[PDB]
Amino acid sequence: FYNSTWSYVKHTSTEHTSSSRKRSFRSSSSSSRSYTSHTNEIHKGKSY
Amino acid sequence: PLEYNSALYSRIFDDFGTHYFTSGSLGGVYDLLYQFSSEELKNSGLTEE
Numbered sequence: 001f002y003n004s005t006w007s008y009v010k011h012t013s014t015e016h017t018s019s020s021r022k023r024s025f026r027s028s029s030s031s032s033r034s035y036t037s038h039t040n041e042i043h044k045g046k047s048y
Numbered sequence: 049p050l051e052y053n054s055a056l057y058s059r060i061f062d063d064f065g066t067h068y069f070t071s072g073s074l075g076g077v078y079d080l081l082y083q084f085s086s087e088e089l090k091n092s093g094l095t096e097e
Contacts, residue, residue, distance in 0.1 A: 004045045012037040 012035075019030035049056055
């Protein structure tokens with residue numbers, strides 16, 4: 001017999017933020033971005 | 049046969065063999081073999097950024 005177990009977790013997080021303000025007239029523009037990529041893998045084998 | 053004949057006499061040894069027991073002990077024979085193997089592996093990683 002052999003009994004085999006594997007566990008695996010992967011996480012990624014990314015953020016971007018930008019804001020601009022001009023005065024002359026007056027103007028503003030802004031943006032926000034957020035991100036995640038995530039993976040889980042579990043794999044097993046058993047022989048008898 | 050009364051005359052020698054190697055084959056027909058040899059049949060005697062085929063059927064009955066060459067010898068008989070004049071002394072002996074009778075008994076029991078016990079033979080045992082036991083063999084065990086175990087292999088065990090563990091791993092656990094963490095990485096964080």
